């Protein structure tokens, strides 16, 4: 896939694409609840993913937010402070977003691609938190408010390493 990367002042990369997801990935469907972002991030980090593995991710995001809030430019367009931000995202079944990917990527030192679905299993843009190539990073699929994991087609391990 040919990228046109733009490094943003917000602190991550952006690129338009025109991609049939299944030509490159397998969609690993995550539970259709408000924890789906954390499920899909756990799918990229834990090979033996469990139904509660997303909790491991969500707890790390809260500490990542406390560590990196004052140096993360993406926070500046939220309209919240740290105390109010944590009070929202720590709610059970509350929707995760790209800012939580931002914090987790900083804490775990892993690159995450977020592919935005515009029509059925087709993506029109992608954002990257990190520098690593696509095949050695976590890829997830943004589907309205839902998130799924994307696993490279010719791979045997679901999680990265
Ligand atoms: Mg257990």
Numbering used by the authors: 5 to 165
Wording from the paper:
One specific mechanism used by nairoviruses is the production of a deubiquitinating enzyme, termed the vOTU, that disrupts the innate immune response. Interestingly, the nairoviral L segment also encodes a viral homologue of the ovarian tumor protease (OTU) at the N-terminus. Instead, the vOTU’s primary function appears to be the reversal of post-translational modifications by ubiquitin (Ub) and the Ub-like protein interferon stimulated gene product 15 (ISG15). Each vOTU possesses a seven-stranded beta sheet as the core feature, with five major alpha helices framing the rest of the structure.
